[PDB]
Amino acid sequence: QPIGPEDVLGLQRITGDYLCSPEENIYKIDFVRFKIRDMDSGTVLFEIKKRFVRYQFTPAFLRLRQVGATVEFTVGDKPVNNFRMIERHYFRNQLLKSFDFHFGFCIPSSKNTCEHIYDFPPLSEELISEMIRHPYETQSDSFYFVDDRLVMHNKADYSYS
Amino acid sequence: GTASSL
Ligand SMILES: *C(=O)CCCCCCCCCCCCC
């Protein structure tokens, strides 16, 4: 019954449903800032401050190599150990790449900040072209674990057109 | 995906 990291690390496609309910966020983890920036140029690509998101990017996005994600979040009454996210990006259900970010320990009622780095998988001119030409068939699942137990699940899709 | 949560 409890979903762990090794379960999601084998996923063959975007999940057809959410693997948990909003009520399984018993730690009351609450994101209050999310920012991604291009590591080459230093440019901010997207910032949001204070379970599905659709992004609309340009073709140039697909030529990035490395992107930094800063996150700020608060936690409620219980301590949070080994907070971790595994986020899997697919095109038409073929894995593009799976990222695995560790956030560590958070004391109760804290706000915490981390920055992690996405390294792009290698993409071929064919693949890119297909990606540009098929908006929103690139999708991602974000799986959030506390102490190896799934507590949140967010979905996203992407256009590069 | 984390942007969903704000
Ligand atoms: C959603 O809320 C997280 C969105 C983060 C988008 C940037 C991540 C880097 C792109 C993943 C690489 C695979 C796509 C080519």
Side-chain angles (χ1 to χ4, degrees), chain A residues 34 36 45-46 53 55 57 61-62 67 69 85 87 89 96-97 99 118-121 123 131 138 140 142 144 154-156 158 160, chain B residues 1-4:
Chain A
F34 177 74
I36 43 161
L45 302 156
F46 182 81
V53 67
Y55 288 95
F57 290 129
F61 190 90
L62 295 166
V67 163
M85 177 192 72
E87 182 169 276
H89 294 261
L96 305 176
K97 175 162 200 190
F99 299 88
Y118 293 86
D119 286 311
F120 280 43
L123 307 165
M131 279 174 84
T138 310
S140 70
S142 300
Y144 307 74
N154 291 332
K155 289 177 169 291
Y158 306 82
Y160 308 96
Chain B
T2 301
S4 307

PDB file of all heavy atoms in Angstrom, chain A residues 34 36 45-46 53 55 57 61-62 67 69 85 87 89 96-97 99 118-121 123 131 138 140 142 144 154-156 158 160, chain B residues 1-4, ligand 1:
ATOM      1  N   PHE A  34       8.959  28.901  -6.356  1.00  0.00           N
ATOM      2  CA  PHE A  34       9.527  28.009  -7.331  1.00  0.00           C
ATOM      3  C   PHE A  34      10.149  28.829  -8.441  1.00  0.00           C
ATOM      4  O   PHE A  34       9.469  29.659  -9.093  1.00  0.00           O
ATOM      5  CB  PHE A  34       8.484  27.064  -7.883  1.00  0.00           C
ATOM      6  CG  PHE A  34       9.008  26.167  -8.932  1.00  0.00           C
ATOM      7  CD1 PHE A  34       9.826  25.124  -8.607  1.00  0.00           C
ATOM      8  CD2 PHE A  34       8.722  26.397 -10.267  1.00  0.00           C
ATOM      9  CE1 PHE A  34      10.347  24.309  -9.581  1.00  0.00           C
ATOM     10  CE2 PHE A  34       9.232  25.577 -11.245  1.00  0.00           C
ATOM     11  CZ  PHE A  34      10.044  24.512 -10.889  1.00  0.00           C
ATOM     12  N   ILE A  36      13.051  28.633 -11.773  1.00  0.00           N
ATOM     13  CA  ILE A  36      14.038  27.962 -12.604  1.00  0.00           C
ATOM     14  C   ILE A  36      14.799  29.007 -13.421  1.00  0.00           C
ATOM     15  O   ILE A  36      14.210  29.970 -13.899  1.00  0.00           O
ATOM     16  CB  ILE A  36      13.440  26.916 -13.556  1.00  0.00           C
ATOM     17  CG1 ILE A  36      12.179  27.410 -14.220  1.00  0.00           C
ATOM     18  CG2 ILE A  36      13.133  25.599 -12.839  1.00  0.00           C
ATOM     19  CD1 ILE A  36      11.860  26.608 -15.477  1.00  0.00           C
ATOM     20  N   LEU A  45      13.735  31.735 -16.182  1.00  0.00           N
ATOM     21  CA  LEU A  45      12.888  31.185 -17.195  1.00  0.00           C
ATOM     22  C   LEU A  45      11.476  31.267 -16.713  1.00  0.00           C
ATOM     23  O   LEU A  45      10.558  31.410 -17.518  1.00  0.00           O
ATOM     24  CB  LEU A  45      13.298  29.734 -17.474  1.00  0.00           C
ATOM     25  CG  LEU A  45      14.767  29.562 -17.920  1.00  0.00           C
ATOM     26  CD1 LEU A  45      15.331  28.166 -17.650  1.00  0.00           C
ATOM     27  CD2 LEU A  45      14.908  29.910 -19.396  1.00  0.00           C
ATOM     28  N   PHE A  46      11.296  31.152 -15.394  1.00  0.00           N
ATOM     29  CA  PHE A  46       9.967  31.067 -14.783  1.00  0.00           C
ATOM     30  C   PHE A  46      10.155  31.230 -13.290  1.00  0.00           C
ATOM     31  O   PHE A  46      11.080  30.637 -12.706  1.00  0.00           O
ATOM     32  CB  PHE A  46       9.288  29.734 -15.124  1.00  0.00           C
ATOM     33  CG  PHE A  46       7.901  29.600 -14.568  1.00  0.00           C
ATOM     34  CD1 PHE A  46       6.795  30.176 -15.211  1.00  0.00           C
ATOM     35  CD2 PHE A  46       7.677  28.937 -13.374  1.00  0.00           C
ATOM     36  CE1 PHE A  46       5.502  30.034 -14.686  1.00  0.00           C
ATOM     37  CE2 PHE A  46       6.388  28.814 -12.849  1.00  0.00           C
ATOM     38  CZ  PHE A  46       5.311  29.375 -13.490  1.00  0.00           C
ATOM     39  N   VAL A  53       0.277  21.604 -13.714  1.00  0.00           N
ATOM     40  CA  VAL A  53       0.735  22.835 -14.346  1.00  0.00           C
ATOM     41  C   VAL A  53       1.070  22.566 -15.836  1.00  0.00           C
ATOM     42  O   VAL A  53       1.652  21.528 -16.190  1.00  0.00           O
ATOM     43  CB  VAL A  53       1.959  23.406 -13.614  1.00  0.00           C
ATOM     44  CG1 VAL A  53       3.177  22.509 -13.753  1.00  0.00           C
ATOM     45  CG2 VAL A  53       2.308  24.802 -14.107  1.00  0.00           C
ATOM     46  N   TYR A  55       3.114  24.301 -18.974  1.00  0.00           N
ATOM     47  CA  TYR A  55       4.075  25.288 -19.314  1.00  0.00           C
ATOM     48  C   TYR A  55       4.056  25.482 -20.836  1.00  0.00           C
ATOM     49  O   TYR A  55       3.743  24.552 -21.603  1.00  0.00           O
ATOM     50  CB  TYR A  55       5.459  24.832 -18.937  1.00  0.00           C
ATOM     51  CG  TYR A  55       5.786  24.814 -17.487  1.00  0.00           C
ATOM     52  CD1 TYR A  55       5.646  23.661 -16.733  1.00  0.00           C
ATOM     53  CD2 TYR A  55       6.289  25.955 -16.864  1.00  0.00           C
ATOM     54  CE1 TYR A  55       5.997  23.644 -15.388  1.00  0.00           C
ATOM     55  CE2 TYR A  55       6.649  25.940 -15.541  1.00  0.00           C
ATOM     56  CZ  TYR A  55       6.481  24.785 -14.792  1.00  0.00           C
ATOM     57  OH  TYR A  55       6.890  24.793 -13.487  1.00  0.00           O
ATOM     58  N   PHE A  57       6.798  27.011 -23.367  1.00  0.00           N
ATOM     59  CA  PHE A  57       8.139  27.476 -23.576  1.00  0.00           C
ATOM     60  C   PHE A  57       8.336  27.626 -25.099  1.00  0.00           C
ATOM     61  O   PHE A  57       7.445  27.314 -25.877  1.00  0.00           O
ATOM     62  CB  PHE A  57       9.154  26.503 -22.982  1.00  0.00           C
ATOM     63  CG  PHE A  57       9.174  26.454 -21.439  1.00  0.00           C
ATOM     64  CD1 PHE A  57       9.086  25.227 -20.768  1.00  0.00           C
ATOM     65  CD2 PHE A  57       9.317  27.615 -20.659  1.00  0.00           C
ATOM     66  CE1 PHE A  57       9.134  25.160 -19.367  1.00  0.00           C
ATOM     67  CE2 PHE A  57       9.350  27.546 -19.256  1.00  0.00           C
ATOM     68  CZ  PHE A  57       9.263  26.319 -18.606  1.00  0.00           C
ATOM     69  N   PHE A  61      14.263  26.550 -25.596  1.00  0.00           N
ATOM     70  CA  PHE A  61      14.278  25.897 -24.292  1.00  0.00           C
ATOM     71  C   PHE A  61      14.972  24.549 -24.461  1.00  0.00           C
ATOM     72  O   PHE A  61      15.846  24.189 -23.691  1.00  0.00           O
ATOM     73  CB  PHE A  61      12.845  25.678 -23.758  1.00  0.00           C
ATOM     74  CG  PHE A  61      12.802  25.239 -22.327  1.00  0.00           C
ATOM     75  CD1 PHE A  61      12.733  26.178 -21.305  1.00  0.00           C
ATOM     76  CD2 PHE A  61      12.875  23.897 -21.998  1.00  0.00           C
ATOM     77  CE1 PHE A  61      12.713  25.789 -19.967  1.00  0.00           C
ATOM     78  CE2 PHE A  61      12.861  23.496 -20.671  1.00  0.00           C
ATOM     79  CZ  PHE A  61      12.782  24.444 -19.652  1.00  0.00           C
ATOM     80  N   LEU A  62      14.570  23.838 -25.501  1.00  0.00           N
ATOM     81  CA  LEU A  62      15.143  22.541 -25.842  1.00  0.00           C
ATOM     82  C   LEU A  62      16.614  22.533 -26.240  1.00  0.00           C
ATOM     83  O   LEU A  62      17.134  21.467 -26.510  1.00  0.00           O
ATOM     84  CB  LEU A  62      14.320  21.894 -26.952  1.00  0.00           C
ATOM     85  CG  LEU A  62      12.883  21.534 -26.609  1.00  0.00           C
ATOM     86  CD1 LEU A  62      12.042  21.219 -27.855  1.00  0.00           C
ATOM     87  CD2 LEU A  62      12.869  20.364 -25.637  1.00  0.00           C
ATOM     88  N   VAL A  67      19.676  23.619 -16.156  1.00  0.00           N
ATOM     89  CA  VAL A  67      18.757  24.560 -15.520  1.00  0.00           C
ATOM     90  C   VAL A  67      18.716  24.438 -13.995  1.00  0.00           C
ATOM     91  O   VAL A  67      18.500  23.345 -13.451  1.00  0.00           O
ATOM     92  CB  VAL A  67      17.371  24.327 -16.100  1.00  0.00           C
ATOM     93  CG1 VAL A  67      16.280  24.939 -15.225  1.00  0.00           C
ATOM     94  CG2 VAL A  67      17.317  24.881 -17.503  1.00  0.00           C
ATOM     95  N   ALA A  69      16.840  24.931 -10.436  1.00  0.00           N
ATOM     96  CA  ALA A  69      15.551  25.079  -9.740  1.00  0.00           C
ATOM     97  C   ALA A  69      15.756  25.425  -8.269  1.00  0.00           C
ATOM     98  O   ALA A  69      16.311  24.624  -7.519  1.00  0.00           O
ATOM     99  CB  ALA A  69      14.773  23.770  -9.832  1.00  0.00           C
ATOM    100  N   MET A  85      12.454  14.374  -3.968  1.00  0.00           N
ATOM    101  CA  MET A  85      11.572  14.370  -5.132  1.00  0.00           C
ATOM    102  C   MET A  85      12.195  13.604  -6.291  1.00  0.00           C
ATOM    103  O   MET A  85      13.384  13.667  -6.547  1.00  0.00           O
ATOM    104  CB  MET A  85      11.173  15.796  -5.559  1.00  0.00           C
ATOM    105  CG  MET A  85      10.297  15.878  -6.818  1.00  0.00           C
ATOM    106  SD  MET A  85      10.150  17.561  -7.484  1.00  0.00           S
ATOM    107  CE  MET A  85      11.764  17.822  -8.180  1.00  0.00           C
ATOM    108  N   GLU A  87      11.338  13.197 -10.200  1.00  0.00           N
ATOM    109  CA  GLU A  87      10.532  13.837 -11.209  1.00  0.00           C
ATOM    110  C   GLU A  87      10.916  13.244 -12.577  1.00  0.00           C
ATOM    111  O   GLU A  87      12.051  13.348 -12.957  1.00  0.00           O
ATOM    112  CB  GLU A  87      10.815  15.356 -11.214  1.00  0.00           C
ATOM    113  CG  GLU A  87       9.955  16.090 -12.222  1.00  0.00           C
ATOM    114  CD  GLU A  87      10.005  17.601 -12.063  1.00  0.00           C
ATOM    115  OE1 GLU A  87       9.239  18.172 -11.212  1.00  0.00           O
ATOM    116  OE2 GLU A  87      10.826  18.196 -12.808  1.00  0.00           O
ATOM    117  N   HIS A  89      10.354  12.950 -16.659  1.00  0.00           N
ATOM    118  CA  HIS A  89       9.937  13.619 -17.908  1.00  0.00           C
ATOM    119  C   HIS A  89       9.892  12.681 -19.109  1.00  0.00           C
ATOM    120  O   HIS A  89      10.878  12.048 -19.397  1.00  0.00           O
ATOM    121  CB  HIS A  89      10.936  14.708 -18.201  1.00  0.00           C
ATOM    122  CG  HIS A  89      10.926  15.801 -17.193  1.00  0.00           C
ATOM    123  ND1 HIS A  89      10.257  16.983 -17.401  1.00  0.00           N
ATOM    124  CD2 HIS A  89      11.461  15.879 -15.950  1.00  0.00           C
ATOM    125  CE1 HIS A  89      10.415  17.762 -16.343  1.00  0.00           C
ATOM    126  NE2 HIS A  89      11.138  17.114 -15.451  1.00  0.00           N
ATOM    127  N   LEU A  96      12.484  10.668 -21.142  1.00  0.00           N
ATOM    128  CA  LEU A  96      13.524  11.592 -21.526  1.00  0.00           C
ATOM    129  C   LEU A  96      14.553  11.651 -20.454  1.00  0.00           C
ATOM    130  O   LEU A  96      15.757  11.646 -20.721  1.00  0.00           O
ATOM    131  CB  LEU A  96      12.957  13.002 -21.712  1.00  0.00           C
ATOM    132  CG  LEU A  96      11.790  13.156 -22.676  1.00  0.00           C
ATOM    133  CD1 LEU A  96      11.251  14.586 -22.689  1.00  0.00           C
ATOM    134  CD2 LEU A  96      12.219  12.762 -24.073  1.00  0.00           C
ATOM    135  N   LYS A  97      14.091  11.774 -19.214  1.00  0.00           N
ATOM    136  CA  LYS A  97      14.999  11.679 -18.119  1.00  0.00           C
ATOM    137  C   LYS A  97      14.290  11.770 -16.750  1.00  0.00           C
ATOM    138  O   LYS A  97      13.255  12.454 -16.611  1.00  0.00           O
ATOM    139  CB  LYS A  97      16.034  12.744 -18.246  1.00  0.00           C
ATOM    140  CG  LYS A  97      16.973  12.795 -17.068  1.00  0.00           C
ATOM    141  CD  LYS A  97      18.239  13.554 -17.418  1.00  0.00           C
ATOM    142  CE  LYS A  97      19.331  13.180 -16.443  1.00  0.00           C
ATOM    143  NZ  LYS A  97      20.448  14.104 -16.649  1.00  0.00           N
ATOM    144  N   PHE A  99      14.805  12.711 -12.716  1.00  0.00           N
ATOM    145  CA  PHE A  99      15.684  13.481 -11.825  1.00  0.00           C
ATOM    146  C   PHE A  99      15.348  13.119 -10.397  1.00  0.00           C
ATOM    147  O   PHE A  99      14.205  12.791 -10.071  1.00  0.00           O
ATOM    148  CB  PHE A  99      15.476  14.988 -12.056  1.00  0.00           C
ATOM    149  CG  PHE A  99      15.811  15.465 -13.477  1.00  0.00           C
ATOM    150  CD1 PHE A  99      14.874  15.452 -14.474  1.00  0.00           C
ATOM    151  CD2 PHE A  99      17.086  15.934 -13.777  1.00  0.00           C
ATOM    152  CE1 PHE A  99      15.174  15.866 -15.767  1.00  0.00           C
ATOM    153  CE2 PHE A  99      17.402  16.348 -15.057  1.00  0.00           C
ATOM    154  CZ  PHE A  99      16.445  16.324 -16.054  1.00  0.00           C
ATOM    155  N   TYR A 118      18.972  20.675 -12.942  1.00  0.00           N
ATOM    156  CA  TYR A 118      18.619  19.718 -13.987  1.00  0.00           C
ATOM    157  C   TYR A 118      19.706  19.737 -15.037  1.00  0.00           C
ATOM    158  O   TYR A 118      20.037  20.822 -15.558  1.00  0.00           O
ATOM    159  CB  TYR A 118      17.322  20.078 -14.694  1.00  0.00           C
ATOM    160  CG  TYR A 118      16.025  20.006 -13.881  1.00  0.00           C
ATOM    161  CD1 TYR A 118      15.612  21.066 -13.122  1.00  0.00           C
ATOM    162  CD2 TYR A 118      15.216  18.893 -13.935  1.00  0.00           C
ATOM    163  CE1 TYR A 118      14.433  21.029 -12.416  1.00  0.00           C
ATOM    164  CE2 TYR A 118      14.033  18.835 -13.230  1.00  0.00           C
ATOM    165  CZ  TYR A 118      13.636  19.912 -12.475  1.00  0.00           C
ATOM    166  OH  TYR A 118      12.452  19.870 -11.788  1.00  0.00           O
ATOM    167  N   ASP A 119      20.206  18.549 -15.401  1.00  0.00           N
ATOM    168  CA  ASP A 119      21.076  18.350 -16.550  1.00  0.00           C
ATOM    169  C   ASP A 119      20.280  17.739 -17.625  1.00  0.00           C
ATOM    170  O   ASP A 119      19.718  16.663 -17.420  1.00  0.00           O
ATOM    171  CB  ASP A 119      22.212  17.413 -16.175  1.00  0.00           C
ATOM    172  CG  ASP A 119      23.221  18.093 -15.313  1.00  0.00           C
ATOM    173  OD1 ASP A 119      23.634  19.189 -15.691  1.00  0.00           O
ATOM    174  OD2 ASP A 119      23.579  17.599 -14.239  1.00  0.00           O
ATOM    175  N   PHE A 120      20.198  18.390 -18.789  1.00  0.00           N
ATOM    176  CA  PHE A 120      19.312  17.862 -19.830  1.00  0.00           C
ATOM    177  C   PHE A 120      19.787  16.496 -20.383  1.00  0.00           C
ATOM    178  O   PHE A 120      20.979  16.256 -20.526  1.00  0.00           O
ATOM    179  CB  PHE A 120      19.161  18.894 -20.964  1.00  0.00           C
ATOM    180  CG  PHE A 120      18.174  20.002 -20.657  1.00  0.00           C
ATOM    181  CD1 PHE A 120      18.143  20.612 -19.405  1.00  0.00           C
ATOM    182  CD2 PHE A 120      17.271  20.426 -21.619  1.00  0.00           C
ATOM    183  CE1 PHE A 120      17.224  21.606 -19.112  1.00  0.00           C
ATOM    184  CE2 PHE A 120      16.356  21.436 -21.341  1.00  0.00           C
ATOM    185  CZ  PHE A 120      16.330  22.022 -20.083  1.00  0.00           C
ATOM    186  N   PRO A 121      18.853  15.593 -20.715  1.00  0.00           N
ATOM    187  CA  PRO A 121      19.348  14.437 -21.432  1.00  0.00           C
ATOM    188  C   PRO A 121      19.819  14.909 -22.817  1.00  0.00           C
ATOM    189  O   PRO A 121      19.470  16.027 -23.224  1.00  0.00           O
ATOM    190  CB  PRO A 121      18.101  13.583 -21.593  1.00  0.00           C
ATOM    191  CG  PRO A 121      16.998  14.594 -21.753  1.00  0.00           C
ATOM    192  CD  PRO A 121      17.407  15.763 -20.899  1.00  0.00           C
ATOM    193  N   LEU A 123      19.411  15.267 -26.612  1.00  0.00           N
ATOM    194  CA  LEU A 123      18.274  15.255 -27.506  1.00  0.00           C
ATOM    195  C   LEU A 123      18.810  15.400 -28.912  1.00  0.00           C
ATOM    196  O   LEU A 123      19.695  16.225 -29.159  1.00  0.00           O
ATOM    197  CB  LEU A 123      17.329  16.427 -27.231  1.00  0.00           C
ATOM    198  CG  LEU A 123      16.824  16.643 -25.801  1.00  0.00           C
ATOM    199  CD1 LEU A 123      16.219  18.045 -25.696  1.00  0.00           C
ATOM    200  CD2 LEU A 123      15.808  15.569 -25.379  1.00  0.00           C
ATOM    201  N   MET A 131       9.231  17.205 -30.669  1.00  0.00           N
ATOM    202  CA  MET A 131       8.815  17.817 -29.405  1.00  0.00           C
ATOM    203  C   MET A 131       8.149  19.173 -29.668  1.00  0.00           C
ATOM    204  O   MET A 131       7.072  19.465 -29.110  1.00  0.00           O
ATOM    205  CB  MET A 131      10.020  17.923 -28.442  1.00  0.00           C
ATOM    206  CG  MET A 131      10.281  16.580 -27.737  1.00  0.00           C
ATOM    207  SD  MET A 131      11.750  16.551 -26.722  1.00  0.00           S
ATOM    208  CE  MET A 131      11.133  17.274 -25.186  1.00  0.00           C
ATOM    209  N   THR A 138       5.010  16.075 -24.338  1.00  0.00           N
ATOM    210  CA  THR A 138       5.979  16.072 -23.301  1.00  0.00           C
ATOM    211  C   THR A 138       5.242  16.330 -21.979  1.00  0.00           C
ATOM    212  O   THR A 138       4.551  17.349 -21.824  1.00  0.00           O
ATOM    213  CB  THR A 138       7.016  17.127 -23.583  1.00  0.00           C
ATOM    214  OG1 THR A 138       7.455  16.946 -24.910  1.00  0.00           O
ATOM    215  CG2 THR A 138       8.247  16.997 -22.665  1.00  0.00           C
ATOM    216  N   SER A 140       5.460  15.434 -17.394  1.00  0.00           N
ATOM    217  CA  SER A 140       6.301  15.047 -16.248  1.00  0.00           C
ATOM    218  C   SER A 140       5.471  14.644 -15.026  1.00  0.00           C
ATOM    219  O   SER A 140       4.336  15.119 -14.852  1.00  0.00           O
ATOM    220  CB  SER A 140       7.317  16.145 -15.895  1.00  0.00           C
ATOM    221  OG  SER A 140       6.721  17.309 -15.338  1.00  0.00           O
ATOM    222  N   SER A 142       5.932  14.447 -10.861  1.00  0.00           N
ATOM    223  CA  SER A 142       6.743  14.811  -9.702  1.00  0.00           C
ATOM    224  C   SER A 142       6.222  14.071  -8.465  1.00  0.00           C
ATOM    225  O   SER A 142       5.069  14.256  -8.029  1.00  0.00           O
ATOM    226  CB  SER A 142       6.651  16.321  -9.456  1.00  0.00           C
ATOM    227  OG  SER A 142       7.104  17.106 -10.548  1.00  0.00           O
ATOM    228  N   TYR A 144       6.858  13.105  -4.459  1.00  0.00           N
ATOM    229  CA  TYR A 144       7.505  13.664  -3.298  1.00  0.00           C
ATOM    230  C   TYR A 144       7.425  12.653  -2.148  1.00  0.00           C
ATOM    231  O   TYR A 144       6.364  12.167  -1.823  1.00  0.00           O
ATOM    232  CB  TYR A 144       6.926  15.049  -2.879  1.00  0.00           C
ATOM    233  CG  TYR A 144       6.864  16.107  -3.984  1.00  0.00           C
ATOM    234  CD1 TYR A 144       5.885  16.032  -5.005  1.00  0.00           C
ATOM    235  CD2 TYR A 144       7.760  17.163  -4.026  1.00  0.00           C
ATOM    236  CE1 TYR A 144       5.830  16.974  -6.001  1.00  0.00           C
ATOM    237  CE2 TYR A 144       7.696  18.138  -5.018  1.00  0.00           C
ATOM    238  CZ  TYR A 144       6.741  18.027  -6.014  1.00  0.00           C
ATOM    239  OH  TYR A 144       6.682  18.969  -7.010  1.00  0.00           O
ATOM    240  N   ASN A 154       2.535  15.711  -8.241  1.00  0.00           N
ATOM    241  CA  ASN A 154       2.180  16.757  -9.170  1.00  0.00           C
ATOM    242  C   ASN A 154       2.507  16.378 -10.635  1.00  0.00           C
ATOM    243  O   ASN A 154       3.499  15.710 -10.899  1.00  0.00           O
ATOM    244  CB  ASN A 154       2.961  17.988  -8.806  1.00  0.00           C
ATOM    245  CG  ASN A 154       2.513  18.594  -7.506  1.00  0.00           C
ATOM    246  OD1 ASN A 154       1.380  18.450  -7.143  1.00  0.00           O
ATOM    247  ND2 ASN A 154       3.397  19.346  -6.846  1.00  0.00           N
ATOM    248  N   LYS A 155       1.663  16.807 -11.564  1.00  0.00           N
ATOM    249  CA  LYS A 155       1.798  16.498 -12.978  1.00  0.00           C
ATOM    250  C   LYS A 155       1.994  17.781 -13.705  1.00  0.00           C
ATOM    251  O   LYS A 155       1.570  18.860 -13.233  1.00  0.00           O
ATOM    252  CB  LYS A 155       0.554  15.820 -13.527  1.00  0.00           C
ATOM    253  CG  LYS A 155       0.395  14.396 -13.027  1.00  0.00           C
ATOM    254  CD  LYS A 155      -0.906  13.790 -13.544  1.00  0.00           C
ATOM    255  CE  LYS A 155      -0.919  12.296 -13.278  1.00  0.00           C
ATOM    256  NZ  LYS A 155       0.102  11.590 -14.138  1.00  0.00           N
ATOM    257  N   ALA A 156       2.680  17.695 -14.838  1.00  0.00           N
ATOM    258  CA  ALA A 156       2.870  18.843 -15.681  1.00  0.00           C
ATOM    259  C   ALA A 156       2.906  18.470 -17.153  1.00  0.00           C
ATOM    260  O   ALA A 156       3.247  17.331 -17.509  1.00  0.00           O
ATOM    261  CB  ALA A 156       4.134  19.558 -15.305  1.00  0.00           C
ATOM    262  N   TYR A 158       4.123  20.315 -21.219  1.00  0.00           N
ATOM    263  CA  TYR A 158       5.009  21.301 -21.746  1.00  0.00           C
ATOM    264  C   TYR A 158       4.750  21.471 -23.232  1.00  0.00           C
ATOM    265  O   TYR A 158       4.478  20.487 -23.947  1.00  0.00           O
ATOM    266  CB  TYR A 158       6.458  20.892 -21.530  1.00  0.00           C
ATOM    267  CG  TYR A 158       6.817  20.570 -20.091  1.00  0.00           C
ATOM    268  CD1 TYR A 158       6.535  19.305 -19.559  1.00  0.00           C
ATOM    269  CD2 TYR A 158       7.417  21.513 -19.260  1.00  0.00           C
ATOM    270  CE1 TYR A 158       6.859  18.981 -18.257  1.00  0.00           C
ATOM    271  CE2 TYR A 158       7.730  21.191 -17.934  1.00  0.00           C
ATOM    272  CZ  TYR A 158       7.438  19.917 -17.448  1.00  0.00           C
ATOM    273  OH  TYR A 158       7.730  19.521 -16.170  1.00  0.00           O
ATOM    274  N   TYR A 160       6.709  23.591 -26.479  1.00  0.00           N
ATOM    275  CA  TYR A 160       7.936  24.285 -26.877  1.00  0.00           C
ATOM    276  C   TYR A 160       7.750  25.046 -28.192  1.00  0.00           C
ATOM    277  O   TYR A 160       8.718  25.487 -28.780  1.00  0.00           O
ATOM    278  CB  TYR A 160       9.096  23.291 -26.989  1.00  0.00           C
ATOM    279  CG  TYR A 160       9.276  22.435 -25.758  1.00  0.00           C
ATOM    280  CD1 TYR A 160       8.716  21.154 -25.692  1.00  0.00           C
ATOM    281  CD2 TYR A 160      10.017  22.891 -24.671  1.00  0.00           C
ATOM    282  CE1 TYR A 160       8.877  20.367 -24.571  1.00  0.00           C
ATOM    283  CE2 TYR A 160      10.175  22.120 -23.546  1.00  0.00           C
ATOM    284  CZ  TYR A 160       9.600  20.848 -23.506  1.00  0.00           C
ATOM    285  OH  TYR A 160       9.744  20.062 -22.384  1.00  0.00           O
TER     286      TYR A 160
ATOM    287  N   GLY B   1       7.027  20.607 -12.150  1.00  0.00           N
ATOM    288  CA  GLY B   1       5.770  20.208 -11.544  1.00  0.00           C
ATOM    289  C   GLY B   1       5.488  20.949 -10.252  1.00  0.00           C
ATOM    290  O   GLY B   1       4.345  21.307  -9.968  1.00  0.00           O
ATOM    291  N   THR B   2       6.535  21.179  -9.466  1.00  0.00           N
ATOM    292  CA  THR B   2       6.399  21.886  -8.188  1.00  0.00           C
ATOM    293  C   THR B   2       5.619  23.216  -8.300  1.00  0.00           C
ATOM    294  O   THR B   2       4.976  23.627  -7.346  1.00  0.00           O
ATOM    295  CB  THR B   2       7.794  22.069  -7.561  1.00  0.00           C
ATOM    296  OG1 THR B   2       8.357  20.763  -7.383  1.00  0.00           O
ATOM    297  CG2 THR B   2       7.731  22.781  -6.206  1.00  0.00           C
ATOM    298  N   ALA B   3       5.652  23.870  -9.458  1.00  0.00           N
ATOM    299  CA  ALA B   3       4.851  25.070  -9.679  1.00  0.00           C
ATOM    300  C   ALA B   3       3.348  24.804  -9.493  1.00  0.00           C
ATOM    301  O   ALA B   3       2.635  25.696  -9.148  1.00  0.00           O
ATOM    302  CB  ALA B   3       5.116  25.668 -11.062  1.00  0.00           C
ATOM    303  N   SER B   4       2.879  23.582  -9.683  1.00  0.00           N
ATOM    304  CA  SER B   4       1.459  23.263  -9.476  1.00  0.00           C
ATOM    305  C   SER B   4       0.987  23.656  -8.088  1.00  0.00           C
ATOM    306  O   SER B   4      -0.141  24.047  -7.922  1.00  0.00           O
ATOM    307  CB  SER B   4       1.177  21.762  -9.560  1.00  0.00           C
ATOM    308  OG  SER B   4       1.668  21.171 -10.735  1.00  0.00           O
TER     309      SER B   4
HETATM  310  C1  LIG C   1       7.437  21.795 -12.916  1.00  0.00           C
HETATM  311  O1  LIG C   1       6.788  22.396 -12.083  1.00  0.00           O
HETATM  312  C2  LIG C   1       8.939  21.536 -12.863  1.00  0.00           C
HETATM  313  C3  LIG C   1       9.326  22.152 -14.226  1.00  0.00           C
HETATM  314  C4  LIG C   1      10.826  22.158 -14.418  1.00  0.00           C
HETATM  315  C5  LIG C   1      11.105  22.392 -15.870  1.00  0.00           C
HETATM  316  C6  LIG C   1      12.632  22.447 -16.106  1.00  0.00           C
HETATM  317  C7  LIG C   1      13.222  21.071 -15.904  1.00  0.00           C
HETATM  318  C8  LIG C   1      14.283  20.769 -16.921  1.00  0.00           C
HETATM  319  C9  LIG C   1      13.589  20.070 -18.084  1.00  0.00           C
HETATM  320  C10 LIG C   1      13.666  18.558 -17.971  1.00  0.00           C
HETATM  321  C11 LIG C   1      14.550  17.985 -19.093  1.00  0.00           C
HETATM  322  C12 LIG C   1      13.737  17.133 -20.086  1.00  0.00           C
HETATM  323  C13 LIG C   1      13.052  18.033 -21.092  1.00  0.00           C
HETATM  324  C14 LIG C   1      13.986  18.156 -22.282  1.00  0.00           C
END
